[PDB]
Amino acid sequence: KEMPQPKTFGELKNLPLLNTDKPVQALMKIADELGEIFKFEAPGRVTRYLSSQRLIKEACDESRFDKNLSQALKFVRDFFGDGLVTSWTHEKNWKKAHNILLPSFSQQAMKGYHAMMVDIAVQLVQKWERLNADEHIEVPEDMTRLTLDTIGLCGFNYRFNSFYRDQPHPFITSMVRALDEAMNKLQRANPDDPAYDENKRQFQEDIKVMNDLVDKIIADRKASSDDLLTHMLNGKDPETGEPLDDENIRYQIITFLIAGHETTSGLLSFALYFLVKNPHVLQKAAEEAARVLVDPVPSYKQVKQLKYVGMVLNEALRLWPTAPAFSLYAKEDTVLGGEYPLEKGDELMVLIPQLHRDKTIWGDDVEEFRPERFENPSAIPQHAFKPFGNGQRACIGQQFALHEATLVLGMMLKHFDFEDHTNYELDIKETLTLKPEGFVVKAKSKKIPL
Ligand code: HEM
Ligand SMILES: COc1ccc2nc(SCc3ncc(C)c(OC)c3C)[nH]c2c1
């Protein structure tokens, strides 16, 4: 078959279609019009957008396709380096860091992180317990305070103290602006035009703010734990026996500070959004939290018991996966779906929110929020649900994210009743990652002691 392709702009091919603040949402509307696969061309490059489980299940065969750096990831690599997110599977520092840092996500490590996650969660709850009755909550802003602080503490034994700040933390502000710039660069035909000189200076300034904080964290540890930073500094790869060098360490710290909170803030924000928009689901979730979290602070085992909360989080990741794309390349010539021949090196993009709206998998109710879809993972076809990527390049933090989000959402639902007081209209801000923008609620304390 000849694959469909959205509208073109002469020598610019499809590139001007990314001239939007909301490119993933634009691509989804394209996929709506064109179907399970379309070509996307730009000067000097081509990729193919996949949206069906039918095709994506083939793309997830690691014998045929390896992780690719998308254009977006290539631009992020300017500050993520060859850390785990942005390294090719075949670069020595991928498997070496993977082997050295994977012990930081063992169940043993997770049990040990639990107390420090509670420390941040309690801070969130006390903030909300302390608001006057006229006040409201800025949801993605507070979920970023929580999630940044959690990775800072658990990962690095470092306190960002975001709840002691009325503006976002400076690290956040620079992070957002760096991700924004990377996103905006996707549409630039002439990236070296002098009209982009200020963007470039701004980008280098934001990358410096981030690296200055890495330096503080590294200096704090040298002056001072068994955590992610301990493994980075002292850990030895069993295969090669070497430790990470200093350059890679720095890339890994910035990688983990960003990738280990931004998307979890998004998830928590979407989940609360869907709960306030779906009162019967909120009741059921709140019923579980009340039944399970019987102690003044949750235990590790209790968070593991919050099954339905877990399902709410998975359903929120189904509709709005917060890292909404990943990319693959063909390891050899191969044919996709019996219909689309690919050559070695051809690029694919998995459009995750559109995969997760495949009516052949989920049914016709795909836009509805129904956590019960997730009651039994065996009843879901292979590769239908991919918010955490695929295979040996899958998200290393998945359990850390989901434990944190399940603990915090559980406490939220135990401690407060929530009101969508403004009848908020979903507005999804894109910074490569996805988050509701301007989402606000009021929270009425149930007055249960902490
Ligand atoms: C809901 C939250 C999260 C989502 C939706 C998310 C999603 C993803 C996805 C889609 C990938 C694959 C990227 C690709 O194939 O190019 C990825 C990889 C990665 N994630 Fe996550 N993630 C989350 C949370 C976390 C957290 C909390 C951490 C750290 C504690 C983390 C660390 C990483 C790392 C290091 C990789 C690269 C792994 C490798 O290739 O070796 N993520 N994640
Ligand atoms: C058109 O090209 C695009 C557009 C938006 C996109 N958003 C993404 S999200 C890709 C991604 N995945 C995983 C992690 C861990 C990560 O760092 C937090 C990022 C940026 N990729 C895109 C590619």
Short mmCIF file of C-alpha atoms and ligand atoms in Angstrom, two decimals:
data_model
loop_
_atom_site.label_atom_id
_atom_site.label_comp_id
_atom_site.label_asym_id
_atom_site.label_seq_id
_atom_site.Cartn_x
_atom_site.Cartn_y
_atom_site.Cartn_z
CA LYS A 1 0.00 0.00 0.00
CA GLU A 2 0.98 3.64 -0.59
CA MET A 3 0.89 5.44 2.74
CA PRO A 4 -1.14 8.58 3.33
CA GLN A 5 0.56 11.93 3.97
CA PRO A 6 -0.89 15.17 5.32
CA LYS A 7 -0.84 18.40 3.42
CA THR A 8 2.48 19.74 2.07
CA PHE A 9 4.16 23.10 1.81
CA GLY A 10 6.45 22.82 -1.22
CA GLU A 11 10.15 22.33 -0.25
CA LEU A 12 9.13 22.63 3.43
CA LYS A 13 7.11 19.36 2.98
CA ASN A 14 5.10 18.79 6.21
CA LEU A 15 7.22 20.86 8.55
CA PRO A 16 4.85 23.83 8.86
CA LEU A 17 2.21 21.51 10.34
CA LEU A 18 4.37 21.57 13.53
CA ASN A 19 3.99 25.36 13.73
CA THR A 20 1.62 25.18 16.64
CA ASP A 21 1.79 25.31 20.42
CA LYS A 22 -0.02 21.89 20.44
CA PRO A 23 1.78 19.62 17.92
CA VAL A 24 0.81 16.20 19.44
CA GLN A 25 -2.85 17.26 19.40
CA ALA A 26 -2.41 18.38 15.78
CA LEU A 27 -0.88 15.02 14.89
CA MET A 28 -3.78 13.23 16.51
CA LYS A 29 -6.23 15.21 14.32
CA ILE A 30 -4.10 14.14 11.32
CA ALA A 31 -4.32 10.51 12.43
CA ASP A 32 -8.11 10.96 12.77
CA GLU A 33 -8.22 12.03 9.07
CA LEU A 34 -5.56 9.58 7.68
CA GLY A 35 -5.80 6.48 9.83
CA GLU A 36 -3.32 4.06 11.34
CA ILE A 37 -0.22 5.23 9.44
CA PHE A 38 0.99 8.39 7.76
CA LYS A 39 4.18 9.71 6.33
CA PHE A 40 5.68 12.92 7.70
CA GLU A 41 8.41 14.60 5.73
CA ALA A 42 10.62 17.55 6.48
CA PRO A 43 13.68 18.93 4.67
CA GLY A 44 16.26 16.15 4.94
CA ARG A 45 14.13 13.65 7.04
CA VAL A 46 11.15 11.33 7.01
CA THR A 47 9.26 9.47 9.69
CA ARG A 48 6.04 7.44 9.80
CA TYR A 49 3.37 8.02 12.41
CA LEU A 50 1.69 4.84 13.72
CA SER A 51 -1.62 4.87 15.57
CA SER A 52 -3.00 1.33 15.50
CA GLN A 53 -2.33 -1.57 17.86
CA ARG A 54 -2.22 -3.71 14.71
CA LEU A 55 0.96 -1.93 13.52
CA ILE A 56 2.38 -0.87 16.86
CA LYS A 57 2.50 -4.51 18.07
CA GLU A 58 4.92 -5.14 15.19
CA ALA A 59 6.95 -2.03 15.89
CA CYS A 60 7.47 -3.32 19.47
CA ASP A 61 9.32 -6.40 18.18
CA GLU A 62 12.89 -5.74 19.33
CA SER A 63 14.23 -8.24 16.89
CA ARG A 64 13.04 -5.92 14.09
CA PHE A 65 13.07 -2.36 15.57
CA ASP A 66 15.34 -0.62 18.09
CA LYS A 67 14.79 2.72 19.95
CA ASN A 68 15.34 5.77 17.76
CA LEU A 69 16.07 9.26 18.84
CA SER A 70 13.26 11.33 17.48
CA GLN A 71 13.99 14.87 16.41
CA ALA A 72 12.56 15.96 19.76
CA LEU A 73 14.95 13.65 21.64
CA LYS A 74 17.85 14.86 19.57
CA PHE A 75 17.12 18.43 20.63
CA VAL A 76 16.72 17.33 24.32
CA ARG A 77 20.07 15.55 24.08
CA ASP A 78 21.62 19.01 24.05
CA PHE A 79 21.03 18.93 27.81
CA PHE A 80 20.33 15.26 28.56
CA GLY A 81 23.52 14.13 26.78
CA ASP A 82 24.10 10.40 26.70
CA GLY A 83 22.10 9.81 29.79
CA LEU A 84 19.60 6.95 29.81
CA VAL A 85 16.77 8.78 27.91
CA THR A 86 18.78 10.12 25.11
CA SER A 87 21.44 7.50 24.46
CA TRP A 88 21.24 4.99 21.60
CA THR A 89 20.92 1.37 22.67
CA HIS A 90 24.29 0.67 20.99
CA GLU A 91 26.28 3.45 22.85
CA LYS A 92 28.38 1.98 25.58
CA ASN A 93 26.96 4.32 28.20
CA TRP A 94 23.38 3.05 27.66
CA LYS A 95 23.77 -0.48 28.92
CA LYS A 96 26.59 0.58 31.38
CA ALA A 97 24.35 3.18 33.12
CA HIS A 98 21.41 0.92 32.92
CA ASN A 99 23.25 -1.84 34.74
CA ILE A 100 24.68 0.62 37.34
CA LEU A 101 21.37 2.46 38.02
CA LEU A 102 18.84 -0.35 37.80
CA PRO A 103 19.47 -1.44 41.50
CA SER A 104 18.07 1.96 42.50
CA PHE A 105 14.61 0.65 41.34
CA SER A 106 14.66 -2.74 43.03
CA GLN A 107 11.78 -3.47 45.36
CA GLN A 108 14.30 -3.10 48.25
CA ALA A 109 15.14 0.43 47.08
CA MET A 110 11.39 1.20 46.72
CA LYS A 111 10.63 0.10 50.27
CA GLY A 112 13.38 2.43 51.35
CA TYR A 113 12.02 5.37 49.31
CA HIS A 114 8.55 5.00 50.77
CA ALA A 115 9.17 7.12 53.99
CA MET A 116 10.66 9.99 52.05
CA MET A 117 7.72 9.95 49.55
CA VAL A 118 5.36 10.23 52.58
CA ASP A 119 7.40 13.19 53.90
CA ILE A 120 6.60 15.12 50.64
CA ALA A 121 3.00 13.90 50.46
CA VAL A 122 2.27 15.08 53.98
CA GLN A 123 3.61 18.48 52.98
CA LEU A 124 1.09 18.60 50.10
CA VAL A 125 -1.81 17.59 52.37
CA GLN A 126 -0.84 20.15 55.11
CA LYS A 127 -0.65 22.87 52.45
CA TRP A 128 -4.19 22.12 51.40
CA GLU A 129 -5.46 21.67 55.02
CA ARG A 130 -4.09 25.20 55.64
CA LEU A 131 -5.85 27.14 52.88
CA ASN A 132 -8.58 29.56 53.88
CA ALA A 133 -12.14 28.66 52.70
CA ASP A 134 -12.10 31.26 49.91
CA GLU A 135 -8.89 29.85 48.34
CA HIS A 136 -8.34 27.32 45.58
CA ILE A 137 -5.59 24.92 44.38
CA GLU A 138 -3.54 25.26 41.21
CA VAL A 139 -3.33 21.55 40.44
CA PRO A 140 -0.36 21.08 37.98
CA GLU A 141 1.64 23.72 40.01
CA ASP A 142 1.24 21.79 43.25
CA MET A 143 1.74 18.44 41.63
CA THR A 144 5.06 19.74 40.29
CA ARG A 145 6.03 20.90 43.82
CA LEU A 146 5.31 17.41 45.03
CA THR A 147 6.95 15.42 42.31
CA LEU A 148 10.14 17.51 42.05
CA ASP A 149 10.61 17.36 45.76
CA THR A 150 10.09 13.61 45.78
CA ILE A 151 12.79 12.85 43.19
CA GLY A 152 15.13 15.43 44.77
CA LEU A 153 14.77 13.74 48.20
CA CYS A 154 14.56 10.08 47.21
CA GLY A 155 17.06 10.36 44.37
CA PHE A 156 19.64 12.80 45.73
CA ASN A 157 18.82 13.48 49.42
CA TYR A 158 18.34 17.06 48.43
CA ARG A 159 15.46 19.34 49.54
CA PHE A 160 14.15 21.69 46.85
CA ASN A 161 11.60 22.94 49.45
CA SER A 162 9.06 23.71 46.75
CA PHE A 163 6.22 24.09 49.30
CA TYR A 164 8.14 26.96 50.90
CA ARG A 165 7.91 28.86 47.61
CA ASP A 166 5.07 30.82 46.10
CA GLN A 167 6.58 30.82 42.60
CA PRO A 168 7.75 27.77 40.81
CA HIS A 169 11.21 26.74 41.66
CA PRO A 170 13.84 28.33 39.35
CA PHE A 171 14.90 24.88 38.15
CA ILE A 172 11.31 24.38 36.96
CA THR A 173 11.13 27.66 35.16
CA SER A 174 14.30 26.88 33.19
CA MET A 175 13.21 23.28 32.59
CA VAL A 176 9.91 24.44 31.09
CA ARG A 177 11.62 26.97 28.91
CA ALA A 178 14.24 24.42 27.69
CA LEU A 179 11.48 21.85 26.82
CA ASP A 180 9.48 24.66 25.13
CA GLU A 181 12.48 25.66 23.00
CA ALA A 182 13.17 22.01 22.01
CA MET A 183 9.49 21.66 21.01
CA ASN A 184 9.56 24.94 19.06
CA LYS A 185 12.71 23.94 17.24
CA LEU A 186 10.81 21.01 15.64
CA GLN A 187 9.19 23.52 13.15
CA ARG A 188 12.35 25.60 12.30
CA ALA A 189 13.49 25.22 8.69
CA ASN A 190 16.46 27.57 9.21
CA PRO A 191 17.68 26.90 12.75
CA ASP A 192 20.79 29.05 12.15
CA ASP A 193 18.98 32.16 10.94
CA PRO A 194 20.12 35.05 13.23
CA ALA A 195 16.44 35.57 14.18
CA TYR A 196 17.01 32.53 16.54
CA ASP A 197 20.08 33.95 18.26
CA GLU A 198 18.15 35.08 21.34
CA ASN A 199 16.37 31.58 21.58
CA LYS A 200 19.85 30.07 21.52
CA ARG A 201 21.22 32.37 24.27
CA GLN A 202 18.10 31.77 26.35
CA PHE A 203 18.52 27.98 25.88
CA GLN A 204 22.16 28.07 27.06
CA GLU A 205 21.10 30.18 30.08
CA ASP A 206 18.39 27.63 31.01
CA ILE A 207 20.82 24.73 30.59
CA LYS A 208 23.26 26.58 32.91
CA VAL A 209 20.57 27.07 35.60
CA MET A 210 20.00 23.32 35.46
CA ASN A 211 23.66 22.43 35.57
CA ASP A 212 24.33 24.88 38.47
CA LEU A 213 21.77 22.93 40.50
CA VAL A 214 23.42 19.59 39.52
CA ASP A 215 26.69 21.08 40.83
CA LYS A 216 25.03 22.05 44.18
CA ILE A 217 23.65 18.47 44.52
CA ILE A 218 27.05 16.94 43.74
CA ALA A 219 28.80 19.40 46.18
CA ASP A 220 26.13 18.67 48.92
CA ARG A 221 26.89 14.91 48.59
CA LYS A 222 30.73 15.39 48.64
CA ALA A 223 30.36 17.51 51.83
CA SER A 224 27.84 15.09 53.53
CA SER A 225 22.95 7.65 52.01
CA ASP A 226 22.07 4.67 49.74
CA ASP A 227 20.30 6.22 46.75
CA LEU A 228 20.38 6.90 43.05
CA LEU A 229 23.20 9.43 43.43
CA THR A 230 25.24 6.83 45.52
CA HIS A 231 25.02 4.37 42.56
CA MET A 232 25.90 7.06 40.05
CA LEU A 233 29.01 8.02 42.05
CA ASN A 234 30.23 4.67 43.32
CA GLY A 235 28.45 1.97 41.31
CA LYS A 236 30.35 -0.37 38.98
CA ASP A 237 28.88 -2.00 35.89
CA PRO A 238 29.19 -5.76 36.42
CA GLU A 239 29.82 -6.41 32.65
CA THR A 240 32.72 -3.99 32.08
CA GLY A 241 33.49 -3.39 35.84
CA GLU A 242 33.85 0.42 35.22
CA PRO A 243 31.96 3.26 36.99
CA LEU A 244 30.33 6.20 35.21
CA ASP A 245 32.57 9.06 34.40
CA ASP A 246 31.85 12.61 35.64
CA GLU A 247 30.46 13.88 32.35
CA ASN A 248 27.85 11.09 32.15
CA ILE A 249 27.00 11.41 35.84
CA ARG A 250 26.02 15.06 35.27
CA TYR A 251 23.77 14.07 32.33
CA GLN A 252 22.18 11.40 34.39
CA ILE A 253 21.39 13.77 37.29
CA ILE A 254 19.63 16.23 34.96
CA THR A 255 17.87 13.32 33.21
CA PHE A 256 16.52 11.93 36.35
CA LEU A 257 15.52 15.33 37.94
CA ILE A 258 13.33 16.03 34.78
CA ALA A 259 12.19 12.59 33.60
CA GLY A 260 11.69 11.55 37.26
CA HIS A 261 9.04 14.21 38.01
CA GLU A 262 7.56 16.10 35.01
CA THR A 263 5.46 13.27 33.63
CA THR A 264 4.33 12.16 37.11
CA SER A 265 3.08 15.71 37.81
CA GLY A 266 1.18 15.49 34.54
CA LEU A 267 -0.29 12.10 35.46
CA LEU A 268 -1.48 13.26 38.87
CA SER A 269 -2.99 16.38 37.26
CA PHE A 270 -4.86 14.42 34.59
CA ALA A 271 -6.04 11.87 37.10
CA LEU A 272 -7.54 14.49 39.41
CA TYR A 273 -9.08 16.16 36.37
CA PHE A 274 -10.80 12.95 35.28
CA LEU A 275 -11.91 12.16 38.88
CA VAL A 276 -13.68 15.57 39.27
CA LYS A 277 -15.29 15.13 35.86
CA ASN A 278 -16.49 11.62 36.72
CA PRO A 279 -18.09 11.69 40.20
CA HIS A 280 -18.97 7.98 40.38
CA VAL A 281 -15.32 7.04 39.74
CA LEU A 282 -14.22 9.57 42.40
CA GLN A 283 -16.54 7.95 44.99
CA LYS A 284 -15.24 4.50 44.28
CA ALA A 285 -11.68 5.73 44.45
CA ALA A 286 -12.36 7.56 47.70
CA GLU A 287 -14.08 4.49 49.15
CA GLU A 288 -11.00 2.42 48.53
CA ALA A 289 -8.66 5.03 50.02
CA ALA A 290 -10.85 5.27 53.23
CA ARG A 291 -11.03 1.46 53.58
CA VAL A 292 -7.34 0.87 52.92
CA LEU A 293 -5.43 3.81 54.44
CA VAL A 294 -6.49 3.14 58.04
CA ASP A 295 -3.35 4.61 59.66
CA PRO A 296 -2.36 8.25 59.99
CA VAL A 297 0.33 7.80 57.31
CA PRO A 298 0.27 5.08 54.65
CA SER A 299 2.52 2.09 54.65
CA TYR A 300 4.25 0.56 51.72
CA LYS A 301 2.01 -2.47 51.87
CA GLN A 302 -1.14 -0.28 51.98
CA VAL A 303 -0.20 1.67 48.80
CA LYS A 304 0.21 -1.74 47.14
CA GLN A 305 -3.42 -2.48 48.20
CA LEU A 306 -4.84 0.60 46.42
CA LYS A 307 -5.87 -1.35 43.33
CA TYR A 308 -8.58 0.84 42.02
CA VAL A 309 -6.45 3.95 42.50
CA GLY A 310 -3.90 2.10 40.33
CA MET A 311 -6.54 1.56 37.73
CA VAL A 312 -7.55 5.20 37.78
CA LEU A 313 -3.86 6.13 37.09
CA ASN A 314 -3.63 3.63 34.18
CA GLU A 315 -6.86 4.98 32.63
CA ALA A 316 -5.52 8.52 32.94
CA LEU A 317 -2.31 7.34 31.16
CA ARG A 318 -4.57 5.70 28.51
CA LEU A 319 -6.31 8.96 27.52
CA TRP A 320 -3.39 11.33 28.13
CA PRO A 321 0.01 9.54 28.31
CA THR A 322 2.30 12.33 29.58
CA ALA A 323 5.31 11.43 27.38
CA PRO A 324 3.05 10.99 24.35
CA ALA A 325 5.44 9.62 21.74
CA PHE A 326 8.38 7.35 21.27
CA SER A 327 10.40 6.49 18.16
CA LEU A 328 11.84 3.34 16.55
CA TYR A 329 14.07 2.51 13.54
CA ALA A 330 14.12 -0.58 11.36
CA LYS A 331 17.16 -2.74 12.20
CA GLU A 332 16.90 -4.34 8.71
CA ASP A 333 14.58 -4.16 5.68
CA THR A 334 11.24 -5.44 6.74
CA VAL A 335 7.55 -5.16 5.88
CA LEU A 336 5.12 -3.62 8.28
CA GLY A 337 1.63 -5.05 8.49
CA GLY A 338 2.04 -7.07 5.19
CA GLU A 339 1.61 -3.73 3.41
CA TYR A 340 4.28 -1.16 4.08
CA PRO A 341 7.81 -2.01 3.15
CA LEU A 342 10.50 -0.38 5.17
CA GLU A 343 14.25 -0.07 4.52
CA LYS A 344 16.95 -0.45 7.16
CA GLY A 345 17.19 2.73 9.15
CA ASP A 346 13.57 3.91 8.41
CA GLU A 347 12.04 5.81 11.35
CA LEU A 348 8.70 5.32 13.03
CA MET A 349 6.90 7.37 15.61
CA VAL A 350 4.38 5.77 17.99
CA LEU A 351 1.60 8.28 18.61
CA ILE A 352 0.63 7.00 22.01
CA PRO A 353 -2.62 8.87 22.70
CA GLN A 354 -3.96 7.71 19.38
CA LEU A 355 -2.90 4.13 19.96
CA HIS A 356 -4.82 4.29 23.22
CA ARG A 357 -7.97 5.39 21.29
CA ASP A 358 -7.94 2.31 18.95
CA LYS A 359 -11.61 1.32 18.96
CA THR A 360 -10.75 -2.26 17.80
CA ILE A 361 -9.11 -2.68 21.23
CA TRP A 362 -11.01 -0.57 23.65
CA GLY A 363 -14.54 -0.52 22.20
CA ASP A 364 -16.62 2.40 21.05
CA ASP A 365 -16.63 4.09 24.43
CA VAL A 366 -12.86 5.11 23.96
CA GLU A 367 -13.25 8.69 25.13
CA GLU A 368 -14.91 7.62 28.41
CA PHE A 369 -12.95 7.42 31.66
CA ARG A 370 -13.41 3.88 32.96
CA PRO A 371 -10.74 2.49 35.22
CA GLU A 372 -12.42 -0.91 35.14
CA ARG A 373 -10.89 -1.43 31.70
CA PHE A 374 -7.76 -2.33 33.67
CA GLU A 375 -9.19 -4.97 36.00
CA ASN A 376 -7.40 -7.79 34.18
CA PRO A 377 -4.15 -7.16 32.16
CA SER A 378 -4.64 -10.63 30.53
CA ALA A 379 -7.79 -9.42 28.81
CA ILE A 380 -5.88 -6.60 27.09
CA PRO A 381 -4.14 -7.38 23.74
CA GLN A 382 -0.36 -7.24 23.56
CA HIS A 383 1.11 -3.79 23.02
CA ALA A 384 -2.29 -1.92 23.23
CA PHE A 385 -1.12 0.16 26.22
CA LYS A 386 2.25 1.71 26.07
CA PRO A 387 2.58 4.82 28.30
CA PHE A 388 6.00 3.66 29.53
CA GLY A 389 7.53 2.71 26.16
CA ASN A 390 8.79 -0.69 25.13
CA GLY A 391 11.23 -3.58 25.80
CA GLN A 392 14.72 -2.98 27.05
CA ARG A 393 14.27 0.83 26.49
CA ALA A 394 11.06 0.91 28.57
CA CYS A 395 10.79 3.44 31.42
CA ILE A 396 13.19 2.48 34.22
CA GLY A 397 11.09 4.59 36.68
CA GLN A 398 7.67 3.16 36.09
CA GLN A 399 7.26 1.61 39.51
CA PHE A 400 8.70 4.68 41.25
CA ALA A 401 6.16 6.92 39.33
CA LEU A 402 3.17 4.72 39.98
CA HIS A 403 4.05 4.15 43.67
CA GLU A 404 4.38 7.90 44.23
CA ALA A 405 1.21 8.74 42.32
CA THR A 406 -0.83 5.99 44.01
CA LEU A 407 0.37 7.07 47.51
CA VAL A 408 -0.36 10.77 46.84
CA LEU A 409 -3.67 10.29 45.08
CA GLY A 410 -4.74 7.87 47.87
CA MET A 411 -3.95 10.49 50.53
CA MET A 412 -5.72 13.21 48.57
CA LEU A 413 -8.88 11.15 48.34
CA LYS A 414 -8.69 10.11 52.07
CA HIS A 415 -8.26 13.67 53.27
CA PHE A 416 -10.43 15.90 51.05
CA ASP A 417 -13.57 16.29 49.00
CA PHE A 418 -12.83 18.01 45.72
CA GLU A 419 -14.85 20.55 43.80
CA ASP A 420 -14.51 21.53 40.14
CA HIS A 421 -15.57 25.03 41.10
CA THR A 422 -14.92 26.71 37.82
CA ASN A 423 -16.34 23.93 35.45
CA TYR A 424 -12.83 23.77 34.11
CA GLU A 425 -12.42 23.25 30.38
CA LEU A 426 -9.51 20.91 29.61
CA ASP A 427 -6.66 22.77 27.98
CA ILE A 428 -3.63 20.54 27.33
CA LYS A 429 -0.28 22.44 27.37
CA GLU A 430 2.56 20.86 25.37
CA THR A 431 6.24 20.99 26.34
CA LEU A 432 7.00 17.73 24.59
CA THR A 433 5.31 16.36 27.71
CA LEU A 434 1.63 17.01 28.41
CA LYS A 435 -0.20 18.62 31.31
CA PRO A 436 -3.58 20.34 31.93
CA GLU A 437 -3.02 24.12 31.96
CA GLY A 438 -5.02 26.25 34.41
CA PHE A 439 -6.66 23.29 36.06
CA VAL A 440 -7.95 24.52 39.50
CA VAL A 441 -10.16 22.86 42.20
CA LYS A 442 -11.23 23.51 45.75
CA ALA A 443 -10.54 20.94 48.40
CA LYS A 444 -12.76 20.61 51.54
CA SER A 445 -10.97 18.90 54.35
CA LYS A 446 -12.58 15.83 55.86
CA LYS A 447 -10.58 16.73 59.02
CA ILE A 448 -8.82 13.36 59.38
CA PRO A 449 -5.60 13.53 61.41
CA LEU A 450 -2.19 13.15 59.84
C1 HEM B 1 3.88 8.74 34.61
C2 HEM B 1 5.19 8.95 34.63
C3 HEM B 1 6.12 8.55 33.47
C4 HEM B 1 5.87 8.31 32.17
C5 HEM B 1 4.48 8.42 31.44
C6 HEM B 1 7.15 7.97 31.59
C7 HEM B 1 7.32 7.58 30.29
C8 HEM B 1 8.45 7.12 29.70
C9 HEM B 1 8.55 6.63 28.34
C10 HEM B 1 7.48 6.64 27.25
C11 HEM B 1 9.80 6.23 28.15
C12 HEM B 1 10.40 5.65 26.85
C13 HEM B 1 11.04 6.74 25.97
C14 HEM B 1 11.45 6.28 24.62
O1 HEM B 1 11.18 5.12 24.21
O2 HEM B 1 12.08 7.15 23.91
C15 HEM B 1 10.58 6.47 29.36
C16 HEM B 1 11.92 6.18 29.57
C17 HEM B 1 12.60 6.54 30.69
N1 HEM B 1 12.09 7.00 31.92
FE1 HEM B 1 10.05 7.25 32.32
N2 HEM B 1 8.10 7.88 32.57
C18 HEM B 1 7.57 8.24 33.74
C19 HEM B 1 8.20 8.38 34.95
C20 HEM B 1 9.50 8.22 35.22
C21 HEM B 1 10.19 8.41 36.46
C22 HEM B 1 9.53 8.71 37.78
C23 HEM B 1 11.51 8.19 36.23
C24 HEM B 1 12.68 8.21 37.20
C25 HEM B 1 12.56 7.94 38.49
C26 HEM B 1 11.70 7.90 34.80
C27 HEM B 1 12.90 7.67 34.16
C28 HEM B 1 13.07 7.27 32.84
C29 HEM B 1 14.35 6.85 32.25
C30 HEM B 1 15.74 6.97 32.88
C31 HEM B 1 14.03 6.36 30.87
C32 HEM B 1 15.06 5.86 29.86
C33 HEM B 1 15.21 4.37 30.21
C34 HEM B 1 16.20 3.68 29.27
O3 HEM B 1 16.00 3.81 28.04
O4 HEM B 1 17.20 3.14 29.78
N3 HEM B 1 10.45 7.93 34.21
N4 HEM B 1 9.71 6.89 30.29
C1 LIG B 2 6.67 15.83 16.61
O1 LIG B 2 7.64 15.27 17.53
C2 LIG B 2 7.36 15.14 18.90
C3 LIG B 2 6.42 16.01 19.49
C4 LIG B 2 6.11 15.92 20.85
C5 LIG B 2 6.74 14.93 21.62
N1 LIG B 2 6.69 14.66 22.94
C6 LIG B 2 7.59 13.66 23.16
S1 LIG B 2 7.78 13.06 24.75
C7 LIG B 2 9.31 12.25 24.56
C8 LIG B 2 9.95 11.82 25.90
N2 LIG B 2 9.76 10.56 26.29
C9 LIG B 2 10.25 10.11 27.43
C10 LIG B 2 10.93 10.89 28.32
C11 LIG B 2 11.37 10.23 29.62
C12 LIG B 2 11.20 12.31 28.00
O2 LIG B 2 11.73 13.15 28.93
C13 LIG B 2 10.81 13.51 30.00
C14 LIG B 2 10.65 12.81 26.74
C15 LIG B 2 10.81 14.23 26.33
N3 LIG B 2 8.29 13.27 22.06
C16 LIG B 2 7.78 14.08 21.01
C17 LIG B 2 8.03 14.15 19.63
#
